[PDB]
Write a protein that binds this DNA or RNA. Structure first.
Ligand code: SF4
Length: 207
DNA sequence: TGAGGCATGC
């Protein structure tokens, strides 16, 4: 995968500019641009989503579309300052399809081989940022760091620690904010509450 | 429109 394209540097601007050159999997070809993380190395909370969506791929920034707006409300309800956040995605290029007779770009879940190929960028970000806690937003991100057998619905809101992760941060898994939109509106407010609770667990981690 | 975890299809 991407490991040869990751330069030996902790400068997020250099990593981001290099990601524009990555050939670690096929996603780079149909996407507009790599969407790297956003934030500074002084962040103590890192949050990892699945992939850039349609709006993210057009803007070049993580979490700018509907799921990111919901994440924004979740952050405010958990009293998490954005000054403490570095936010990124497990996969750096937008994976999508279109209906043959349609124009809208329809997001497709990254394959597990794409997550594995792209994980060197995530490791590079984690070493550069040295977060005290990593929030895994959804199954793709959580499995990226915790193994393909990990079930976010089974262990969300738990403070976890694994050995093979650089810097031994606390890890907190939760559901991706888009799941609240995809699921029934009847469950949406309860689901938002659950997200906010998990985020509160993550913000109260003390190294 | 914007998951999750299991199942089936080739
Ligand atoms: S997705 Fe990750 S690994 Fe695949 S190309 Fe874009 S950057 Fe390289």
């Amino acid at each position: 995968g991407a490991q040869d394209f990751v330069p030996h540097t902790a400068d997020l601007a250099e990593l981001a500019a290099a990601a524009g050159e990555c050939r670690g999997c096929g996603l780079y070809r149909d996407a507009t641009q790599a969407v790297f993380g956003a934030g500074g190395r002084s962040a103590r909370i890192m949050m990892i989503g699945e992939q850039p969506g349609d709006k993210e791929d057009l803007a070049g920034l993580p979490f700018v579309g509907p799921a990111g707006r919901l994440l924004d409300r979740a952050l405010e309800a958990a009293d998490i300052d954005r000054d403490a956040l570095y936010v990124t995605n497990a996969v750096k290029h937008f994976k999508f399809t279109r209906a043959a007779g349609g124009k809208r770009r329809i997001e497709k879940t990254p394959s597990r081989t794409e997550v594995v190929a792209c994980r060197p960028w995530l490791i590079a970000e984690m070493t550069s940022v040295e977060p005290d806690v990593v929030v895994l937003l959804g199954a793709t991100a959580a499995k990226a760091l915790l193994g393909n057998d990990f079930r976010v619905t089974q262990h969300r809101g738990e403070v976890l620690h694994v050995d093979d992760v650089p810097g031994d941060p606390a890890l907190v898994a939760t559901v991706h904010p888009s799941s609240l939109l995809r699921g029934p509106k009847e469950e949406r407010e309860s689901a938002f509450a659950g997200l906010v609770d998990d985020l509160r667990v993550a913000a109260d981690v003390r190294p």
